Amino acid sequence: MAYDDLHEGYATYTGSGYSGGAFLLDPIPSDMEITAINPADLNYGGVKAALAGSYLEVEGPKGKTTVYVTDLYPEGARGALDLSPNAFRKIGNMKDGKINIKWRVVKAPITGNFTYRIKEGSSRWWAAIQVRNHKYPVMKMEYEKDGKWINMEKMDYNHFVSTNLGTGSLKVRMTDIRGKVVKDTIPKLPESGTSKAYTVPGHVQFPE
Length: 208
Prior knowledge:
6-stranded mixed β-barrel; 8-stranded antiparallel β-sheet; 2 helices; Barwin-like endoglucanases; peptidoglycan-binding protein; mainly beta; 2 domains; 208 residues; Immunoglobulin-like
């Protein structure tokens, strides 16, 4: 109904998600509080991986904490989260196995601008571009070509994808879950698909 509405569900805990999570957000600091998220809640607004790299404030029987969303919780029911143990311990008893929670999307406790990650295989012909360090969920990414703004499809693996992106620097614009839009420019994509993924610095952030 609204993006920041309270969700009721359950949480278990897991050690997965620090490395190899579905949203390709590595490296994740080993002491970060993180979660995997069920697929229905993940795909808010009909955007795949809408909530990938979002932060959630999660309340359990013992208190509240904030977690970075790094992975899919496969087959997870609506409302359900698979927390890292450092997060789970803060809000419940690990000996219970599974606890009732209430959670909502919150502003990222971060500083600085976006960083972009260009997936391996990317070029001006086909590219997958991830936004990192974003204050709110990224719902939309578009790039400019011949004076037109082209919408990029967000994929399950938390990158936006297009083909035939054109030449020169890539002018992009990002829309958050509140509908705030920021514009940035990324250097030229390679002329042949890259063998390795790489990151490039961004210069903008969603407003407070």
